[PDB]
């Protein structure tokens, strides 16, 4: 199923689903927490020309949203206002309860005309678009976001 | 003498671990929403197929009372709650060795 | 693969800081300021490995997000807690067994 990492002491190892270790202890739901990690840490180029090439428009795919409790400070963040020659908006309006990325050192604003070959915009590499504790596969208009991926780990906080 | 039930069940469903590959999960190059589903057929068994249709018709009665009571427009936790009740009935209370309610065998 | 050994993460914790008087909705904190800061450093293994898991977790998570019809899925964490308990105590627990976690 979904991979879940465990940290015994100051080291992260992963336990296969079929095996069963009784030494692992889950005391409460607070131990489990979901952490998003931005692509900046992965050494990819954060420049505007490379970011717009990674994103692409696609139809027939419904959007999906996943929540993440913890996130990382982003040096570069992107806000998109994009229209076509007819003035129509390629990206949808931000839904209720969704807000921009909380911590951004630089917010890049790119406003230009281009064709959209799809209803929603997805990441070609498959990276999720970060938001305020809600990760979405599609971009939303006028909302600052970061490129990141989400992980789930087990923390042995009390012993 | 009872061919009201259909012994052949051709079912549409989704795919959990069905595809172990890693170059297609990305939604941009992924398949369309209409094509994600996988098909399967169960046949040559009278009991399993007819009993399935029997349970859901009876389950509908109790399920309606649950939906009316809950204010949620969409309740996805019905199945997950059942798993919680499964564990709570056995290990919820003090588990006595060699007891009827406690599941422990020495 | 480039890794950042310093992890500066913003998160909210329910249990860690309970200050009081900030819960009132009229005087409560602004949306931008509710978050708290933390820093992870001086570790080669834990910091880089976390970025490795999330890149790989996207694979299994994408198939799950496609399978679920909910627009917003908050039940991912709750499902894992159930599976953890179901794997051990779900069935009959035999004393001194490999699956059973019982020690006399």
């Amino acid at each position, epitope marked *: 199923s979904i*991979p879940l990492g465990v940290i015994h002491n100051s080291t992260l190892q992963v336990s296969d689903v079929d095996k069963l270790v009784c030494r692992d202890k889950l005391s409460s739901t607070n131990q489990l927490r979901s952490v998003g990690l931005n692509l900046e840490g992965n050494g990819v180029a954060t420049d505007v020309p490379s970011a717009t090439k990674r994103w692409g428009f696609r139809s027939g795919v419904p959007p999906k949203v996943v929540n993440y409790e913890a996130g990382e400070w982003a040096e570069n963040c992107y806000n998109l206002e994009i229209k076509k020659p007819d003035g129509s908006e390629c990206l949808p309006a931000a839904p209720d309860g969704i807000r921009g990325f909380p911590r951004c050192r630089y917010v890049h604003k790119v406003s230009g005309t281009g064709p959209c070959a799809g209803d929603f915009a997805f990441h070609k590499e498959g990276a999720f678009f970060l938001y305020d504790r809600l990760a979405s596969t599609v971009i939303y208009r006028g909302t600052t976001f970061a490129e990141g991926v989400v992980a789930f780990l087990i923390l042995p906080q009390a012993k | 003498a009872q061919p009201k039930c259909n012994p052949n069940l051709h079912y549409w469903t989704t795919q959990d671990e069905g595809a172990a590959i890693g170059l297609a999960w990305i939604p941009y190059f992924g398949p369309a929403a209409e094509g994600i589903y996988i098909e399967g057929l169960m046949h040559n068994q009278d009991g399993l197929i007819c009993g399935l249709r029997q349970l859901a018709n009876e389950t509908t009665q109790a399920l309606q009372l649950f939906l009316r009571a809950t204010t949620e427009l969409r309740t996805f936790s019905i199945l997950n709650r059942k798993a919680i009740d499964f564990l709570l009935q056995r290990w919820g209370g003090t588990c006595h060795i060699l007891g009827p309610d406690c599941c422990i065998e020495p | 693969p480039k890794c950042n050994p310093n992890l500066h993460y913003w998160t909210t914790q329910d249990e860690g800081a309970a200050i009081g008087l900030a819960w009132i909705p009229y005087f409560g904190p602004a949306a931008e300021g509710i978050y708290i800061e933390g820093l992870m450093h001086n570790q080669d293994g834990l910091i880089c490995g976390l970025r490795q898991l999330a890149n790989e977790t996207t694979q299994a998570l994408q198939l799950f997000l496609r399978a679920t019809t909910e627009l917003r899925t908050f039940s991912i964490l709750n499902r894992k807690a159930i599976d953890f308990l179901l794997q051990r105590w779900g069935g009959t627990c035999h004393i001194l067994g490999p699956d059973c976690c019982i020690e006399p």
Partner: antibody
Amino acid sequence: VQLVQSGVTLVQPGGSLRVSCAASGFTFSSYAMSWVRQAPGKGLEWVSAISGLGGSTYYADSVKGRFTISRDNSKNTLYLQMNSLRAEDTAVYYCAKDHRVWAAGYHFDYWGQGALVTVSS
Amino acid sequence: DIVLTQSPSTLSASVGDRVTITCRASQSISSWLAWYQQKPGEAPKLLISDASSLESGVPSRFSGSGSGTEFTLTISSLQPDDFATYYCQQYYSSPTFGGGTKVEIK
């Protein structure tokens, strides 16, 4: 950047056998491995795959029941434990490493020499 | 699932002759494809990946093109070392190897 398979093996029907794929010269845990078998006079067939981290394991529809894959990052060795062997499973098994993608995709640049397993009994 | 097919199985060729192999996948796998090279008794060697980019240490004469369902592996000049079986693997679906193309001299 070389992968070493087991030299020779022989088994019986339904027998159990372990194949060890040794890896050295480059970082192992960074990449995800996979098993590919080649039957005599037949094309390559994918057996099983495991992610670089080891949390996710992947098997073929025919191979999911009777095969088990495991890897240890500390020893840099890939173990494929084979159970309930059949005559159709007699093939030279190959283990390879990712060509380009890092723990994402299954591309293979560099392949091992292969291990021969004969279930004819 | 998805299984690609190869038009030529055994292609006769000579030194310095242009060779083109056509590998067509049943569904649309977009740009994710690779070609392999296997000599008798030797492990398969990666020729090209993604159908665009060539692996380091691979001769520059080898090239490939095509998008979506259609793919063509083209060798502008054939060499004595070049006689081996060639398979095409697509990563979109479950891993599927082609029938293979063996090259001989006639």
